[PDB]
Design a protein around this ligand. Sequence first.
Ligand SMILES: [Ca+2]
Ligand SMILES: [Zn+2]
Ligand SMILES: [Zn+2]
Ligand SMILES: [Zn+2]
Length: 90
Amino acid sequence: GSEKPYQCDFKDCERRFSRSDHLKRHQRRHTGVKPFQCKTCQRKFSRSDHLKTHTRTHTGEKPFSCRWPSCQKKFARSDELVRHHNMHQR
DNA sequence: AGCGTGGGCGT
DNA sequence: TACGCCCACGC
Ligand SMILES: [Ca+2]
Ligand SMILES: [Zn+2]
Ligand SMILES: [Zn+2]
Ligand SMILES: [Zn+2]
């Protein structure tokens, strides 16, 4: 039970948000607006944070390293590493 | 497996 | 406002 006065008025959408920007971000799912552009491949994206991880597909940057002993696996995204770590154990 | 992308939060 | 982090789901 929170204060989320920013309601999405799109048809049949009953989502609400705590700050105006989070609502505007969500609304791009309805409109398909993609304000951000990768300058390497020209692809456009709805979100700068998703643009940022996309660009690691060009640079090869892999900031997330497996902690398992003798494993040298690295990943671009933290969720990729979570999935890998779940694999060592089961 | 690698990564688009939606929603939850943050400084 | 800018600019994310993490998680989850779905190809
Ligand atoms: Ca509504
Ligand atoms: Zn909506
Ligand atoms: Zn690109
Ligand atoms: Zn590993």
